[PDB]
């Protein structure tokens, strides 16, 4: 995954979830869209 | 067609005006015709959503102050520089 | 036809038999026969006129290879048979490349009624003139 300080929805299947106080982008379509730490 | 409920400003100057805008109002004045100018305080949100329309700057407004009605027209508005809010409005009588 | 069971649409100009450079095993990847584009397809092509590709439904059954009936002449080479230059469209609508007389499209549209969407003459008239909008063909009113 991509640890960035701007996490965004790159696709329409991407989805912002906060787990353990960490903003994350969980996608189902493309696993390259998986992101962390916004 | 706009009715703007107002009060009379018993205080003026920069202290009183800045106190008046922190309380979510803003000052204004009604001058023109032969009468004395009338210092007026106005609620902020009503006038801001009201002036989002175009007809606020063209149509004759009606300002209700002390239970009277003064048919005015919005002459000139001072806006805040970098915020979407108002500093002051000049209303010419009509 | 039915649910999609090994029918596709492919060939080029069918004045000749069995186009080997353009498609080849594209008509041999599914159960569609290699031989049935060569003799019997031209036997079913000579019934009207040659020199036209045919996008066609080839339903491959548990028979020898399949059974085939050609139904409609398509409007691509029907709107290229008398349009202008023989090269192609490129950027046809921003200038005036082609022009088509509308009476022959009224009679071909009056002929073609199987593979269309419409029940009135005027309803499907400027649909083929929409294909004239496709290749920039200026209609002569």
């Amino acid at each position: 995954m991509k640890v960035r300080a701007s996490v965004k929805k790159l696709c329409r299947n991407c989805k912002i979830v906060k787990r353990d106080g960490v903003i994350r982008v969980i996608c189902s379509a493309e696993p390259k869209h998986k992101q962390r730490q916004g | 067609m706009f009715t703007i409920n107002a009060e009379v400003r018993k205080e003026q100057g920069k202290g009183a005006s800045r106190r008046l805008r922190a309380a979510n109002k803003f000052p204004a004045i009604i001058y023109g015709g032969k009468e004395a100018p009338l210092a007026i305080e106005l609620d902020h949100d009503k006038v801001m959503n009201m002036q989002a329309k175009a007809e606020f700057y063209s149509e004759v407004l009606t300002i209700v102050v002390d239970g009277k009605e003064i048919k005015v027209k919005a002459q000139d508005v001072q806006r805040h520089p970098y915020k979407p809010k108002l500093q002051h409005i000049d209303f010419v009588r009509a | 036809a039915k649910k999609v069971q090994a029918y596709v649409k492919l060939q080029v100009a069918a004045g000749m038999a069995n186009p080997s450079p353009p498609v080849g095993p594209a008509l041999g990847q599914q159960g569609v026969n290699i031989m049935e584009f060569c003799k019997a397809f031209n036997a079913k092509t000579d019934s009207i006129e040659k020199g036209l590709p045919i996008p066609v439904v080839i339903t491959v059954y548990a028979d020898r290879s399949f059974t085939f009936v050609t139904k409609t002449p398509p409007a691509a080479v029907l709107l290229k048979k008398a349009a202008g230059i023989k090269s192609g469209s490129g950027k046809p609508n921003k200038d005036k490349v082609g022009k088509i007389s509308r009476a022959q499209l009224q009679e071909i549209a009056q002929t073609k009624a199987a593979d269309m969407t419409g029940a009135d003459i005027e309803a499907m008239t400027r649909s083929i003139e929409g294909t004239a909008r496709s290749m920039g063909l200026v209609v002569e009113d």
Partner: protein, 136 residues
């Protein structure tokens, strides 16, 4: 890069950047990129932002750069002591206050003006906002 064609004196004092701005309404165009932060803007940041806008809303539209640098900023070289004169003119900045409409745009829909002004406000050092042409 923007720079005055011909000055009157080569080196300017620092001076300060206080108070609010003068160019405040969207005057020429229809949509505006208005400053909120104070800061100052070099000519490279104005050029960078203008290329972001001009790319973004393609060669349609019309864009006004309402600020102009005209203030020379001098720097001393590296491993030079203090003193021994004022430095050399390296670049040119415009001083910005809260309220300056930095850019204007006309001839596009509002949603492209949002898009180009987002794209170009990320090339500037000051916090910025979007404004429209208000009528009086």
């Amino acid at each position: 890069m923007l720079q005055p064609k011909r000055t009157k004196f080569r080196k300017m004092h620092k001076g300060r950047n206080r108070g609010l701005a003068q160019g405040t309404d969207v005057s020429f165009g229809s949509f505006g990129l208005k400053a909120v932060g104070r800061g100052r803007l070099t000519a490279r940041q104005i050029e960078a932002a203008r290329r972001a806008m001009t790319r973004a809303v393609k060669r349609q539209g019309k864009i006004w750069i309402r600020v102009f640098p005209d203030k020379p900023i001098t720097e001393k070289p590296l491993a030079v002591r203090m003193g021994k004169g004022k430095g050399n003119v390296e670049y040119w900045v415009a001083l910005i206050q809260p309220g300056k409409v930095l850019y204007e745009m006309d001839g596009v829909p509002e949603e492209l003006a949002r898009e180009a002004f987002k794209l170009a406000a990320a090339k500037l050092p000051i916090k910025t906002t979007f404004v429209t042409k208000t009528v009086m």
